[PDB]
Amino acid sequence: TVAYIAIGSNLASPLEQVNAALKALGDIPESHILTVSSFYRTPPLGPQDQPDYLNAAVALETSLAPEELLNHTQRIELQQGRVRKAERWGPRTLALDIMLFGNEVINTERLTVPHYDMKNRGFMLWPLFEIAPELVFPDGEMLRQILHTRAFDKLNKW
Numbered sequence: 001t002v003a004y005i006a007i008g009s010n011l012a013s014p015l016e017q018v019n020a021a022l023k024a025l026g027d028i029p030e031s032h033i034l035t036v037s038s039f040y041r042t043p044p045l046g047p048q049d050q051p052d053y054l055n056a057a058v059a060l061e062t063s064l065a066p067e068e069l070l071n072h073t074q075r076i077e078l079q080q081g082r083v084r085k086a087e088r089w090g091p092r093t094l095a096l097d098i099m100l101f102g103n104e105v106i107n108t109e110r111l112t113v114p115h116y117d118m119k120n121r122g123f124m125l126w127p128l129f130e131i132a133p134e135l136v137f138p139d140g141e142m143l144r145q146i147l148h149t150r151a152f153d154k155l156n157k158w
């Protein structure tokens with residue numbers, strides 16, 4: 001099954017973090033990376049005196065069950081990133097999100113796929129569109145139609 005995974009880092013110096021994350025994704029058993037999007041840049045949320053986000057999408061071929069893949073993305077998040085000590089409930093430094101898992105729809109305590117908000121997020125949709133322009137969501141909606149109708153601004157490359 002092809003899983004699509006979003007990578008997002010908010011480190012002031014995110015490159016090695018993202019490259020290490022890609023290495024780790026490629027080390028996941030029963031899986032291999034099919035392709036990786038370009039690296040994109042998005043602005044911080046709220047105050048602008050914060051670091052930009054580095055965003056990318058990864059297509060991963062896997063024979064793991066969705067929850068098993070989640071185990072690995074969670075592990076990689078723990079091993080390669082951290083919480084902010086002042087805002088521990090907040091976002092981690094490295095985020096790996098399973099955007100799509102084949103054509104599967106999943107709604108469990110641990111896992112919701114497709115990612116619940118991805119259709120509203122250009123920073124997820126554009127890198128995905130670079131590596132899977134013909135993608136159709138499980139509900140039948142076309143990625144091309146979402147980007148076109150909703151008129152997202154494009155993202156700058158990292």
Ligand SMILES: [Cl-]
Pocket residue numbers: 114137138139140
């Ligand atoms: Cl869907």
